[PDB]
Design a binder for this molecule. Sequence first.
Ligand code: HEM
Length: 453
Amino acid sequence: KEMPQPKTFGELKNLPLLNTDKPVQALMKIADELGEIFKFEAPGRVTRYLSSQRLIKEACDESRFDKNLSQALKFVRDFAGDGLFTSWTHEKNWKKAHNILLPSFSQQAMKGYHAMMVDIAVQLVQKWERLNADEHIEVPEDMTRLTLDTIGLCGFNYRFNSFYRDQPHPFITSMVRALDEAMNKLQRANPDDPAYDENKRQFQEDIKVMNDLVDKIIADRKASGEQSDDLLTHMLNGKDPETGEPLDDENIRYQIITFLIAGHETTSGLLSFALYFLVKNPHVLQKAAEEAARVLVDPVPSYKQVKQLKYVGMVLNEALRLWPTAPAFSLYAKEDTVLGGEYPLEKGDELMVLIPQLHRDKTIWGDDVEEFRPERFENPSAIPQHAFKPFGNGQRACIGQQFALHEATLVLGMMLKHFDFEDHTNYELDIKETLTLKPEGFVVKAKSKKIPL
Ligand code: HEM
């Protein structure tokens, strides 16, 4: 069977389709037109975009397919190195870091981070409490302040103090620009053309800024000797049970850079989309706010009370269904194989999983896929295998899933406890794409319910 393919541009093939500031959303539109699979070609490379649970469940078979570094991730690898996110499965440092860090990211480990997560969450609530009447909130911006601060504090005992600033930390200016430069190199023609001398000079300056600041944080912790229980202490002391080896300082830096990218980009988006959907669906907002008031009976929320917020968890999973903030991941065929009993693949052939389209698969979810209904995630066992993949697949799934969800559930619980929300502008959804998705310009007013902290 001949594989569907979108419109070509002569010798440039399909590559000019990505020359747009919303490539994922364009690929989603192409998927609606062409269906469950389509071919995508650029000069000297090819991949296949998958959109149905039927094909993606086979793609998620770890005996047949393994994580591939997409072109974007290969560019991100120039500053994320061989950290967990940008390393190949067969690289020694992946399995080492994975075995070392798994216990630090578990559900039990969240009991340890909870205190510091509340520290930052209280700073968000107090900011909003202290706004004057008729002032508004810039939601993505404020969620990013929170999520960046939380990973900095919980991870490496470093306070970015984003709620004390308008202009971001020097690390973040370099990190955001490096990610932008990684994204812009996908849409580019010729690399060594000296017209991009300033692009390369900035990118190398941004690498050095991230490396120097993070390497200083490693050396300062080593020289201190103090044992503040966090990601950095676990990495300096911990040993891989398999090889018996620790991570060296170069890899540790890459893991820290990786966690800062993660805790900045994806996690704030989840909270942003979640609040968007809540203000656009007042009955769902009502249910979640009712739970928050009933469950969060103390001024300082405990770990147990965050686990008790079941409906707030359902709200977040439905936000992850409609707009998964890390919307695509790449795979490659380990051997020759046949996908879906009709698409023969050779060893090394690549696949892209388009997660927003998987999450709109009508044969799994029904015909109302665009509606925001948290009741879909009432029973987690009711969701078929590989139907809901906002945190990726298998051994290369998101190590920060429990961190992200605990943080988002705590913060969204507290937000719903302490405020009523107004969509005062009648905000029209406008999704800006970088590494991740964000509702750009999403604003609300938060009127206080006047419950003390
Ligand atoms: C809403 C929040 C988040 C989402 C939607 C998300 C999504 C994902 C996805 C889809 C992957 C798989 C990438 C691939 O297959 O190429 C992944 C990997 C990863 N994420 Fe996240 N993530 C989130 C938050 C976090 C946080 C907070 C951290 C760390 C503090 C984190 C750390 C990682 C790491 C290290 C990997 C690489 C795992 C490995 O291959 O060993 N993520 N994430």
